Design a protein around this ligand. Structure first.
Ligand SMILES: CCN(CC)CCNC(=O)c1c(C)[nH]c(/C=C2\C(=O)Nc3ccc(F)cc32)c1C
Length: 287
C-alpha cells in the first residue's frame, strides 16, 4: 500500500479539515514512540488541549496509527483519556485530547516515592479502566507508568492506546510481539497465543516501578531483559521488605506466569489491598 492510499484510508477515520488556524500557543510537553505531544490553546473557547502529532511516514508499524484515534473514539470511561477531535494535517495525524495538568506517572515516580495508599489509588483507577476495556475485548499491551496521566485534582487516566489490539469472535487471541520490553508478559515475548491477561502482568511490572523506581532487569538491554522475563520465575521487588503483606499478595496475583491463573482486572478490584485507596486528593501532593 502506498503512502497516499494509507493516508486516504486513515482520512476515513479523522474529522475533516485543517485545525491550524483554530489553535495557538503551541508548546511541546512530551515526546513519544509514535510522535510528539504539544500543549496548545483553542481560539474560540480558550480551552487548553494536548495535541499529539504523528508522522505517517516514520512509524514502526503505520497501521497502528488507526489505534491512536479509534480506541478513544469507541471507548469512553472515567479513567480513560478523552479525545476531542482528530485531523490529518499535511503528512501528520493530529489527535486532540484533554490536557491533564498532572502529567505522566513516570515523571512522578522518578521524582517522589509513592506510599501504599497512593499506589492503591493508582491501581484502582487503572484496574477500572482495564476491567472496562477488557470487557470490550481491548488488549492495551503497553501498560507502564508512561501510559498513566493525572488530572490537576489527582484523577488517574489511562492513555497511549497505539499498541491496542481489538479481539473478536474470529480472532480471539493475538500472537504478535507488541509492547515495551521490560513490561511485556512472558507469553507475549514467547509469541504464544494471548489475550487480555497480558495487561495484568504489565500492571504488576508498573507496581514494581512504583515501589522500586524501575522495572525489573532495567540495567539489562531490552532483549536480554526479555530473555530473562521469558525464562525466569516472576521478578521480585527489590524493596519487598518495605511493603505490606497485603500489597505483596496483590502483586503476586498479577505476576503469575500461568496466564489463566493470573488474576483478572475484575478480580483485582475485589482485592483487600484496594481497601487502602485514598481519595484522589492523596495524589495531589505528587503533582
Ligand atoms: C518540568 C516538567 N514536568 C516534569 C518533567 C512535567 C512534564 N510533563 C508535562 O508537562 C505533561 C503534561 C502537563 N501533560 C502531559 C501529557 C498529556 C496531557 O496533558 N494530555 C494527554 C493526552 C494524551 C497523551 F498521550 C498525553 C497527554 C505531559 C507529558
Amino acid at each position: 500500500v502506498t503512502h497516499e492510499q494509507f493516508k486516504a484510508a486513515l482520512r476515513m477515520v479523522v474529522d475533516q479539515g485543517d485545525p491550524r488556524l483554530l489553535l495557538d500557543s503551541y508548546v511541546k510537553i512530551g515526546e513519544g514512540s509514535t510522535g510528539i505531544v504539544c500543549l496548545a490553546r483553542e481560539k474560540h473557547s480558550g480551552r487548553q488541549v494536548a495535541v499529539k502529532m504523528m508522522d505517517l511516514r516514520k512509524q514502526q508499524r503505520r497501521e497502528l496509527l488507526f489505534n491512536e484515534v479509534v480506541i478513544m473514539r469507541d471507548y469512553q470511561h472515567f479513567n480513560v483519556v478523552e479525545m476531542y477531535k482528530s485531523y490529518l494535517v499535511g503528512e501528520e495525524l493530529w489527535v486532540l485530547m484533554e490536557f491533564l495538568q498532572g502529567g505522566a506517572l513516570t515523571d512522578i515516580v522518578s521524582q517522589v516515592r509513592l506510599n501504599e495508599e497512593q499506589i492503591a489509588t493508582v491501581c484502582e483507577a487503572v484496574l477500572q479502566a482495564l476491567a472496562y476495556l477488557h470487557a470490550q475485548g481491548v488488549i492495551h499491551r503497553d501498560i507502564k507508568s508512561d501510559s498513566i496521566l493525572l488530572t490537576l485534582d489527582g484523577r488517574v487516566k489511562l492513555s497511549d492506546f497505539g499498541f491496542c489490539a481489538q479481539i473478536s469472535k474470529d480472532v480471539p487471541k493475538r500472537k504478535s510481539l507488541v509492547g515495551t520490553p521490560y513490561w511485556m508478559a512472558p507469553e507475549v515475548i514467547s509469541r504464544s497465543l494471548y489475550a487480555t491477561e497480558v495487561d495484568i502482568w504489565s500492571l504488576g511490572i508498573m507496581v514494581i516501578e512504583m515501589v522500586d523506581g524501575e522495572p525489573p532487569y532495567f540495567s539489562d538491554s531490552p532483549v536480554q531483559a526479555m530473555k530473562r522475563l521469558r525464562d525466569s520465575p516472576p521478578p521480585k521487588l527489590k524493596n519487598s521488605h518495605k511493603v505490606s503483606p497485603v500489597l505483596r499478595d496483590f502483586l503476586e496475583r498479577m505476576l503469575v506466569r500461568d496466564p489463566q491463573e493470573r488474576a483478572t482486572a475484575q478480580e483485582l478490584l475485589d482485592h483487600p489491598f484496594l481497601l487502602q485507596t485514598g481519595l484522589p486528593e492523596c495524589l495531589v501532593p505528587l503533582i
